[PDB]
């Protein structure tokens, strides 16, 4: 089984520094690029950084350029994010993810507390439904992204899980009631019959352009009493 274990999160003062670590097992660590994606409290997913297979090249998001440094030790199968000059905006749960575009495995995340791109828009923002219902989520892109569109499921209290990649291809182990379709700028994720485990927040992510960008997400919750 594939395992990603983050550590290093904690409370720090603004301007301070932290070092996050990710321990990987169950796959050839050196064969893949590794990324950090963060989620601010009550907000959506945001790609932070990516490092290539042998540490040759690194990419950063504009908000962290100059303050963050990603590194890896392929002998220790470990990934590092050195966060310097921390700000209040940096407060978030930081996730360790495999790959650079299609994040097929995620760690559980570590919480860090501080005392021109393609825009993806999801609709609805939230929706209340019941078991057995049919749910349809729409993801729209500011410019054409062909079919380079992924869908992630994030159950409450859990890390994101890859559902669909390249618009319509189901990930191994995903139930058939999930289906994805669309092209260009307009995409849909459909759950044909809701099950109690399907109540979660769903995110769409484009990897047509670097950096990859996410939608705000769609919360699918049970109908309140």
Residue numbers in the entry: 3 to 117, 134 to 243
Which passages does the manuscript contain on this structure?
The M2 is a proton-selective ion channel, and it plays a pivotal role in the uncoating of the viral core during entry and viral assembly. M2 ectodomain (M2e) is a potential universal candidate for monoclonal antibody therapy owing to its conserved nature across influenza virus subtypes and its importance in viral propagation. We selected a 10-mer conserved epitope of the N-terminal region of the M2 ectodomain as SLLTEVETPI (labeled U1) used for screening against the Tomlinson (I + J) scFv phage libraries. Four distinct clones (AU1, GU1, JU1, and UU1) were obtained based on changes in the CDR regions.
